[PDB]
Design a protein around this ligand. Structure first.
Ligand SMILES: CCC1(C(=O)/C=C(\O)C(=O)OC)CCN(Cc2cccc(Cl)c2)CC1
Ligand SMILES: [Cl-]
Ligand SMILES: [Cl-]
Ligand SMILES: [Cl-]
Ligand SMILES: [Cl-]
Ligand SMILES: [Mn+2]
Ligand SMILES: [Mn+2]
Length: 180
């Protein structure tokens, strides 16, 4: 596992709280991206990880003049263009709901108004994996109808193992415990 080995090398070598904070954030990003890849593989949909909204609009509506509209330059993780409806997707990996609510509010209020002006039928979809239990939670009614089962095989144990080693190495470092 090249990803695991590279994280392990970084944890073996790190000496400072600030560099450790970056490893921690990087592990959480990699765990998120791992779920996104497994999710798209299981559903046989195109895997993407952060698409500029302008690019999404140009893919679904090539004739658009972006300059006529006030397009917020957000980068949702992914999208599905069925031909009649646009599903905006964001992956989450979390034991809680707070990050889902934050992103749902941001994309609902920033994306839906301009998509209505352009004329593209759009739904905001947030798919969250609980990394401890592997349970999947979906916000997005049309996503649920298209994908009533999600036959993923998730294993987050190695991300937990890496981050726990990092936390243990800095268990007595006040500067780090605050950054985290
Ligand atoms: C750190 C990567 C960024 C991201 O894509 C975050 C997410 O996908 C997210 O938190 O879902 C879990 C890059 C773009 N912007 C938006 C925020 C952070
Ligand atoms: Cl260091
Ligand atoms: Cl964004
Ligand atoms: Cl697509
Ligand atoms: Cl996440
Ligand atoms: Mn993202
Ligand atoms: Mn995401």
């Amino acid at each position: 596992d090249p990803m695991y080995e590279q994280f392990l090398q970084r944890i073996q070598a790190v000496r400072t709280a600030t560099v450790a904070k970056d490893i921690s954030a990087d592990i959480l990003e990699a765990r998120h991206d791992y779920f996104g890849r497994e999710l798209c593989r299981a559903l046989d949909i195109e895997y993407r990880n952060n698409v500029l909204l302008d690019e999404i609009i140009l893919d679904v509506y090539p004739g658009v003049n972006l300059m006529e509209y006030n397009v917020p330059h957000v980068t949702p993780d992914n999208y599905i263009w069925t031909g009649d409806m646009l599903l905006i997707l964001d992956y989450k990996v979390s034991v809680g709901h707070d990050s889902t609510e934050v992103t749902y509010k941001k994309y609902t209020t920033l994306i839906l108004p301009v998509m209505q002006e352009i004329g593209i039928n759009t739904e905001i979809c947030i798919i969250r994996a609980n990394p401890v239990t592997n349970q999947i939670s979906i916000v997005g009614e049309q996503f649920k109808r298209l994908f009533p089962t999600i036959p993923v095989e998730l294993n987050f144990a190695r991300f937990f193992e890496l981050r726990k080693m990092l936390l243990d190495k800095f268990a007595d470092d006040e500067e780090f415990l605050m950054m985290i």
